């Protein structure tokens, strides 16, 4: 069903994210883990993004999406929802598009390319294709590991979810 197709697609993308393998003297590039995009970077068609989209009824979400085009005439992207049920190709300003990392940072070689404990991030919430505010609880220790995060969640008395796992592909700066 659609649920399964979606979750499978998310796994595929998380798992296929290449590990950055430098040699002595190299630094992790832009979009390796937590290293931000260069100033005035523009994502390429096919690249995955978090995209701030307003529904017809006004609800704003950061959704998982893919760049379709960028117009230098208007400085706007087109992006497509990675969910087939999202039938609208969205036009967005650069401020509504955050490139996802193109490399996984290896905690054993480039730990400065990971988010620090208690950093505020946007992270994809389990069983969804959307990003929400969270604090880093634990970084990955090994290249296969997920982040552990605490989502802001007003259904808890302290305002945070328990530790939930999110892959490096799906954690970006807030």
């Amino acid at each position: 069903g659609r649920r399964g197709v979606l979750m499978t697609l998310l796994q595929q993308s998380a798992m296929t994210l290449p590990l950055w393998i430098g040699k002595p003297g190299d630094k992790p590039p832009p979009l390796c883990g937590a290293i931000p995009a260069s100033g005035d970077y523009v994502a390429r068609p096919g690249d995955k993004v978090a995209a701030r989209v307003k529904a017809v009824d006004g609800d704003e979400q950061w959704i998982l999406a893919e760049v379709v085009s960028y117009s230098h005439a208007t400085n706007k992207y087109e992006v497509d929802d990675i969910d087939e049920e999202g039938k609208e190709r969205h036009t967005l300003s650069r401020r509504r598009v955050i490139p996802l990392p193109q490399w996984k940072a290896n905690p054993e070689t480039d730990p400065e390319a990971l988010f620090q404990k208690e950093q505020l991030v946007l992270a994809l919430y389990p069983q969804t294709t959307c990003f929400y505010r969270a604090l880093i609880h634990a970084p990955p220790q090994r290249p296969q590991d997920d982040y552990s995060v605490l989502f802001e969640d007003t259904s808890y008395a302290d305002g945070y979810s328990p530790p939930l796992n999110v892959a490096q592909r799906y954690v970006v700066a807030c």
């Binding site: 979606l6 979400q61 919430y125 389990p126 969804t128 959307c130």
Partner: peptide, 8 residues
């Protein structure tokens, strides 16, 4: 998209 509100 699949939202948290839908998910929960």
């Amino acid at each position: 998209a699949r939202t948290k509100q839908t998910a929960r």
